[PDB]
Design a protein around this nucleic acid. Sequence first.
RNA 1: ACAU
DNA 2: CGATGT
Length: 136
Amino acid sequence: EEIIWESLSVDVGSQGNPGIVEYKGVDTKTGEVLFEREPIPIGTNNMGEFLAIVHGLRYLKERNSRKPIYSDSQTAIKWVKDKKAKSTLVRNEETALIWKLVDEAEEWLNTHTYETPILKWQTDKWGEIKADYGRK
RNA sequence: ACAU
DNA sequence: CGATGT
Ligand SMILES: [K+]
Ligand SMILES: [K+]
Ligand SMILES: [K+]
Ligand SMILES: [Mg+2]
Ligand SMILES: [Mg+2]
């Protein structure tokens, strides 16, 4: 099992969990940063990992790219497959922004199609995903 | 246990 | 050490 180098890798970064959430997508081969989301004041790791995959799907579809997406998040890969982000984060005024984005990402999944393979990055074999924030 |  | 998730 080898890396598919012609791919997009995504990852979340956070300050606290729940805490400030951001995410980015990079070229797996070169590490070039292809997109970065503005920090969201309160969210969870898994909400961010979910949003990162969905943004990747939208990014690749817009560009007519058949590349797969790598994620290190077992949870978010399942949530995308299911089209449902099963987060425990309370809904209040401080979490409204993240929940709006998660709700809108689910809505996009429920109104669009894609063939993009969503692959598990095998951290135990390959080290940290190329989109990692280097904060752990 | 596994993945973050 | 704590949290988010299956
Ligand atoms: K990190
Ligand atoms: K990881
Ligand atoms: K646990
Ligand atoms: Mg990750
Ligand atoms: Mg990471």
